[PDB]
Amino acid sequence: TDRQIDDQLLNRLRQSLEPHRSGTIPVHLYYQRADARARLRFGATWRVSPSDRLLNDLRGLIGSEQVELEFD
Amino acid sequence: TPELAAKLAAEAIERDPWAAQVSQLSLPKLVEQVALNAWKEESDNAVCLHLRSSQRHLNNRGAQQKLAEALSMLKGSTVELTIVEDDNPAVRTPLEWRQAIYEEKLAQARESIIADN
């Protein structure tokens, strides 16, 4: 959703990814703006492990599984 | 998901008298693209659609005839409508106006995203 705190950017979001790392998966981010859709690539460091879907779906947030950018 | 493209076309219409007129005639799509890629000079009893010669191959009689009936409906009298080829950029068509409007907004959004922190 549009309304995300900030700390979510550097805290919960980051922490979900941080302990489950494996298999160089790029992180792509869709920030739904009122104005437009821009893509900000996290690529901070961590590549997420795949177990994260189940953990993420655990609370209030649905994700979508798109074609990975790298392959194309 | 262009939403923005048709909304953006509404601003183009809100500024260009020809774009507005075409939407009031309620052209289809091919013939609309001809009216859209051409700039509106207006004379005492004439409307001559100067389409960018840069896209000359898009102009086809199948479009022109439908455009002619529509321009005739607008004018209320028979307009000798032809598509003629002078590519000079001195004024902007209803299609050209729109494009500048699509991009700056996206750039501003990108800036806000970069600035989230």
mmCIF file of C-alpha atoms in Angstrom:
data_model
loop_
_atom_site.group_PDB
_atom_site.id
_atom_site.type_symbol
_atom_site.label_atom_id
_atom_site.label_comp_id
_atom_site.label_asym_id
_atom_site.label_seq_id
_atom_site.Cartn_x
_atom_site.Cartn_y
_atom_site.Cartn_z
ATOM 1 C CA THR A 1 0.000 0.000 0.000
ATOM 2 C CA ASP A 2 0.851 3.739 -0.396
ATOM 3 C CA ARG A 3 1.107 4.317 3.325
ATOM 4 C CA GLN A 4 4.298 2.734 4.626
ATOM 5 C CA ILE A 5 6.059 4.118 7.666
ATOM 6 C CA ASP A 6 9.794 4.527 6.648
ATOM 7 C CA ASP A 7 11.026 2.334 9.453
ATOM 8 C CA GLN A 8 9.361 -0.436 7.474
ATOM 9 C CA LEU A 9 11.944 0.366 4.763
ATOM 10 C CA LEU A 10 14.787 -0.009 7.232
ATOM 11 C CA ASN A 11 13.545 -2.429 9.858
ATOM 12 C CA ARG A 12 10.750 -4.977 9.342
ATOM 13 C CA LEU A 13 11.078 -5.220 5.542
ATOM 14 C CA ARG A 14 14.850 -5.376 5.822
ATOM 15 C CA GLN A 15 14.760 -7.798 8.745
ATOM 16 C CA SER A 16 12.450 -10.278 6.985
ATOM 17 C CA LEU A 17 15.007 -10.488 4.152
ATOM 18 C CA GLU A 18 18.137 -10.360 6.324
ATOM 19 C CA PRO A 19 17.954 -13.684 8.122
ATOM 20 C CA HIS A 20 16.778 -15.673 5.089
ATOM 21 C CA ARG A 21 19.488 -15.179 2.466
ATOM 22 C CA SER A 22 20.431 -17.540 -0.370
ATOM 23 C CA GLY A 23 20.340 -17.975 -4.133
ATOM 24 C CA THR A 24 21.163 -14.526 -5.557
ATOM 25 C CA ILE A 25 17.648 -13.261 -6.088
ATOM 26 C CA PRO A 26 17.397 -9.610 -6.988
ATOM 27 C CA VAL A 27 14.926 -7.608 -4.940
ATOM 28 C CA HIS A 28 12.558 -5.485 -6.998
ATOM 29 C CA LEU A 29 10.267 -2.957 -5.374
ATOM 30 C CA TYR A 30 7.001 -1.533 -6.533
ATOM 31 C CA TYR A 31 6.176 1.607 -4.551
ATOM 32 C CA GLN A 32 2.601 2.457 -5.606
ATOM 33 C CA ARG A 33 2.762 6.229 -5.857
ATOM 34 C CA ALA A 34 -0.234 8.453 -6.323
ATOM 35 C CA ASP A 35 1.641 10.128 -9.217
ATOM 36 C CA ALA A 36 3.302 7.157 -10.953
ATOM 37 C CA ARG A 37 4.883 3.741 -10.660
ATOM 38 C CA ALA A 38 8.661 3.958 -10.370
ATOM 39 C CA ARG A 39 10.956 0.989 -9.789
ATOM 40 C CA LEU A 40 13.476 1.469 -6.969
ATOM 41 C CA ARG A 41 15.912 -1.445 -6.890
ATOM 42 C CA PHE A 42 16.796 -2.249 -3.273
ATOM 43 C CA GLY A 43 20.013 -4.145 -4.129
ATOM 44 C CA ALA A 44 21.314 -2.972 -0.769
ATOM 45 C CA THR A 45 23.172 -6.246 -0.344
ATOM 46 C CA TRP A 46 20.998 -9.106 0.666
ATOM 47 C CA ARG A 47 19.587 -11.470 -1.842
ATOM 48 C CA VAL A 48 16.466 -13.021 -0.250
ATOM 49 C CA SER A 49 16.119 -16.715 0.345
ATOM 50 C CA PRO A 50 13.029 -18.150 -1.136
ATOM 51 C CA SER A 51 11.342 -19.221 2.220
ATOM 52 C CA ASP A 52 10.235 -15.589 2.677
ATOM 53 C CA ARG A 53 6.845 -15.928 0.779
ATOM 54 C CA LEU A 54 5.275 -17.997 3.481
ATOM 55 C CA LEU A 55 6.737 -15.774 6.224
ATOM 56 C CA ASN A 56 5.654 -12.590 4.448
ATOM 57 C CA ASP A 57 2.159 -13.852 3.756
ATOM 58 C CA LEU A 58 2.044 -14.419 7.479
ATOM 59 C CA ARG A 59 0.858 -10.823 8.082
ATOM 60 C CA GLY A 60 -1.270 -8.370 6.126
ATOM 61 C CA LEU A 61 0.752 -8.190 2.936
ATOM 62 C CA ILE A 62 0.270 -9.965 -0.336
ATOM 63 C CA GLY A 63 3.166 -10.274 -2.776
ATOM 64 C CA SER A 64 3.342 -11.136 -6.462
ATOM 65 C CA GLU A 65 5.731 -13.445 -8.076
ATOM 66 C CA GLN A 66 6.835 -11.835 -11.367
ATOM 67 C CA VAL A 67 9.343 -13.026 -14.062
ATOM 68 C CA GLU A 68 12.791 -12.297 -12.606
ATOM 69 C CA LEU A 69 14.377 -9.251 -14.257
ATOM 70 C CA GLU A 70 17.863 -10.913 -14.604
ATOM 71 C CA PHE A 71 16.764 -13.797 -16.831
ATOM 72 C CA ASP A 72 15.313 -11.516 -19.527
ATOM 73 C CA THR B 1 -2.825 0.309 -17.600
ATOM 74 C CA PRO B 2 -2.543 3.647 -19.405
ATOM 75 C CA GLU B 3 -5.469 5.307 -17.470
ATOM 76 C CA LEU B 4 -2.966 8.161 -17.468
ATOM 77 C CA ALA B 5 -2.799 8.115 -21.359
ATOM 78 C CA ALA B 6 -6.609 8.709 -21.757
ATOM 79 C CA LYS B 7 -6.675 11.147 -18.807
ATOM 80 C CA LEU B 8 -3.702 12.882 -20.443
ATOM 81 C CA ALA B 9 -5.625 12.932 -23.739
ATOM 82 C CA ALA B 10 -8.383 14.814 -21.859
ATOM 83 C CA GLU B 11 -5.864 17.655 -21.053
ATOM 84 C CA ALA B 12 -4.714 17.561 -24.735
ATOM 85 C CA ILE B 13 -8.431 17.989 -25.746
ATOM 86 C CA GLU B 14 -8.879 20.681 -23.053
ATOM 87 C CA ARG B 15 -6.079 22.713 -24.781
ATOM 88 C CA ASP B 16 -6.189 21.784 -28.551
ATOM 89 C CA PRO B 17 -9.380 22.828 -30.416
ATOM 90 C CA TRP B 18 -8.846 20.047 -33.011
ATOM 91 C CA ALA B 19 -8.394 17.221 -30.464
ATOM 92 C CA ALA B 20 -11.623 18.525 -28.808
ATOM 93 C CA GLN B 21 -13.459 18.660 -32.119
ATOM 94 C CA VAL B 22 -12.358 15.061 -33.045
ATOM 95 C CA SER B 23 -13.591 13.768 -29.646
ATOM 96 C CA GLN B 24 -16.934 15.581 -30.215
ATOM 97 C CA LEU B 25 -17.209 13.984 -33.730
ATOM 98 C CA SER B 26 -16.391 10.744 -31.943
ATOM 99 C CA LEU B 27 -14.026 9.235 -34.509
ATOM 100 C CA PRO B 28 -12.859 5.613 -34.076
ATOM 101 C CA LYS B 29 -9.048 4.844 -33.862
ATOM 102 C CA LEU B 30 -7.206 4.718 -37.278
ATOM 103 C CA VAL B 31 -8.940 7.904 -38.444
ATOM 104 C CA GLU B 32 -8.427 9.433 -34.961
ATOM 105 C CA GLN B 33 -4.648 8.727 -35.247
ATOM 106 C CA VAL B 34 -4.665 10.647 -38.576
ATOM 107 C CA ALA B 35 -6.494 13.619 -36.937
ATOM 108 C CA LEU B 36 -4.127 13.243 -33.919
ATOM 109 C CA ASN B 37 -0.850 13.268 -35.928
ATOM 110 C CA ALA B 38 -1.942 16.487 -37.741
ATOM 111 C CA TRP B 39 -2.088 20.148 -36.675
ATOM 112 C CA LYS B 40 -5.121 22.385 -36.944
ATOM 113 C CA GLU B 41 -4.973 25.406 -39.247
ATOM 114 C CA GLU B 42 -8.463 26.870 -39.665
ATOM 115 C CA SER B 43 -9.672 29.067 -42.558
ATOM 116 C CA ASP B 44 -13.044 30.849 -43.150
ATOM 117 C CA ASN B 45 -14.646 27.644 -44.593
ATOM 118 C CA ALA B 46 -11.781 25.111 -44.488
ATOM 119 C CA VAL B 47 -10.075 22.663 -42.199
ATOM 120 C CA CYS B 48 -7.092 21.040 -43.970
ATOM 121 C CA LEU B 49 -5.451 18.309 -41.874
ATOM 122 C CA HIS B 50 -1.668 18.730 -42.304
ATOM 123 C CA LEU B 51 -0.401 15.318 -41.099
ATOM 124 C CA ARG B 52 3.327 15.056 -40.262
ATOM 125 C CA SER B 53 4.913 13.709 -43.524
ATOM 126 C CA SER B 54 7.159 11.864 -41.013
ATOM 127 C CA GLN B 55 4.203 9.392 -40.730
ATOM 128 C CA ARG B 56 2.890 9.767 -44.362
ATOM 129 C CA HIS B 57 2.390 5.961 -44.718
ATOM 130 C CA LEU B 58 -0.223 5.986 -41.892
ATOM 131 C CA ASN B 59 -2.472 8.299 -43.965
ATOM 132 C CA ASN B 60 -4.807 6.037 -45.997
ATOM 133 C CA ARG B 61 -8.043 6.809 -47.915
ATOM 134 C CA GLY B 62 -9.952 4.372 -45.608
ATOM 135 C CA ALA B 63 -9.111 6.797 -42.798
ATOM 136 C CA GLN B 64 -9.574 9.993 -44.914
ATOM 137 C CA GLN B 65 -13.172 9.110 -45.990
ATOM 138 C CA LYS B 66 -14.264 8.473 -42.364
ATOM 139 C CA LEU B 67 -12.373 11.661 -41.334
ATOM 140 C CA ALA B 68 -14.155 13.540 -44.209
ATOM 141 C CA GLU B 69 -17.655 12.504 -43.129
ATOM 142 C CA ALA B 70 -16.717 13.499 -39.534
ATOM 143 C CA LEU B 71 -15.177 16.886 -40.550
ATOM 144 C CA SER B 72 -18.338 17.420 -42.668
ATOM 145 C CA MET B 73 -20.513 16.654 -39.562
ATOM 146 C CA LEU B 74 -18.389 19.231 -37.578
ATOM 147 C CA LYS B 75 -18.464 21.964 -40.221
ATOM 148 C CA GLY B 76 -22.143 21.216 -40.999
ATOM 149 C CA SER B 77 -21.242 21.585 -44.742
ATOM 150 C CA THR B 78 -19.043 19.709 -47.278
ATOM 151 C CA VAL B 79 -15.332 20.231 -46.467
ATOM 152 C CA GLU B 80 -12.897 19.197 -49.203
ATOM 153 C CA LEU B 81 -10.785 17.243 -46.693
ATOM 154 C CA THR B 82 -7.370 16.006 -47.806
ATOM 155 C CA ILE B 83 -4.258 15.002 -45.772
ATOM 156 C CA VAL B 84 -1.338 17.117 -47.125
ATOM 157 C CA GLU B 85 2.401 16.839 -46.456
ATOM 158 C CA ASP B 86 4.363 19.700 -44.822
ATOM 159 C CA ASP B 87 6.500 18.357 -41.870
ATOM 160 C CA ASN B 88 7.485 21.832 -40.406
ATOM 161 C CA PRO B 89 7.330 21.744 -36.536
ATOM 162 C CA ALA B 90 6.169 25.386 -35.834
ATOM 163 C CA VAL B 91 2.922 24.356 -33.988
ATOM 164 C CA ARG B 92 2.110 21.123 -32.072
ATOM 165 C CA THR B 93 -0.577 18.523 -32.993
ATOM 166 C CA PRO B 94 -2.944 17.091 -30.250
ATOM 167 C CA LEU B 95 -0.772 13.930 -30.114
ATOM 168 C CA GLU B 96 2.489 15.937 -29.727
ATOM 169 C CA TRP B 97 1.152 18.113 -26.794
ATOM 170 C CA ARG B 98 0.313 14.956 -24.743
ATOM 171 C CA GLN B 99 3.819 13.348 -24.806
ATOM 172 C CA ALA B 100 5.619 16.070 -22.845
ATOM 173 C CA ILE B 101 2.878 15.759 -20.236
ATOM 174 C CA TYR B 102 3.348 11.890 -19.839
ATOM 175 C CA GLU B 103 7.070 12.007 -18.855
ATOM 176 C CA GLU B 104 7.730 14.911 -16.377
ATOM 177 C CA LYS B 105 5.161 13.499 -13.934
ATOM 178 C CA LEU B 106 6.909 10.062 -14.018
ATOM 179 C CA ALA B 107 10.251 11.825 -13.350
ATOM 180 C CA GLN B 108 8.770 13.647 -10.314
ATOM 181 C CA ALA B 109 7.445 10.324 -8.962
ATOM 182 C CA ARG B 110 10.914 8.823 -9.367
ATOM 183 C CA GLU B 111 12.389 11.738 -7.390
ATOM 184 C CA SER B 112 9.917 11.189 -4.504
ATOM 185 C CA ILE B 113 10.788 7.459 -4.497
ATOM 186 C CA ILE B 114 14.536 8.275 -4.398
ATOM 187 C CA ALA B 115 13.732 10.670 -1.513
ATOM 188 C CA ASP B 116 11.632 8.132 0.671
ATOM 189 C CA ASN B 117 14.891 7.505 2.556
#
